[PDB]
Amino acid sequence: PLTAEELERGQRLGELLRSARGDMSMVTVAFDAGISVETLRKIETGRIATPAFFTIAAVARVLDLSLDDVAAVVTFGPVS
Amino acid sequence: RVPLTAEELERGQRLGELLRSARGDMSMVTVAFDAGISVETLRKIETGRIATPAFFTIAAVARVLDLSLDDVAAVVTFGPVS
């Protein structure tokens, strides 16, 4: 089973990505990243137990986010 | 079975090669221990034998290796090719 601290990070991750998407459409982000809307939806909502590195890397690219920044706040929470 | 695409396998292999080069002379056991994974997992990652490497695993290994994930992600393409 996934750990408590693992499902927390999932939620943190999804919230960060959703925020970065802002008003951009889910369809356009998914197309530019090469993933499904379903996957993107699941990630944004924290429903994926272990998201794939290349999935997060692709979304981050499209959304102009640093992966190092992403990693830091999944594992530690956002500020403040 | 869902097969990988040529592009997926190749990205996995590039990622593995980059992590292996970053490890350099450092011990696989030490890397695996500090990242919180098995040597078997690190071996498979380094040699491109994991079908879908997990974000949190790659992040942990990169941190141990003082390697920036942005620098690593830079070697690949995502999306329309064009």
Question: What CATH number is attached to the domain comprising A66?
Answer: 1.10.260.40
Is position A10 within any domain?
A: yes
Task: Give chain A's domain count.
Answer: 1
Partner residue opposite B53 with nearest CB, options A31, A52, A62:
A52
∠A37-A42-A47 over CA atoms, to 5°? Answer: 170
Is position B80 within any domain?
A: no
Is position B79 within any domain?
A: no
Q: What is the spatial distance between Cα A37 and Cα A14, in angstroms, rounded to a whole number? A: 14
β-sheet bridge partners, residue A52:
B54
Q: Are B31 and B23 in contact (CB under 8 A)?
A: yes
Establish whether the linkage from the previous residue to A36 is cis, with ω within 30° of 0.
Answer: no
Nearest-CA neighbor of A56 among A25, B64, A42?
A42
Structure tokens at A60: 């981050």
Q: Supply the range of the domain harboring residue A64.
A: 3-72
A50–B56: do the CB atoms touch at under 8 Å? yes
Is position B14 within any domain?
A: yes
B56–A6: do the CB atoms touch at under 8 Å? yes
Which residue do the tokens 């030490």 mark? Answer: B30
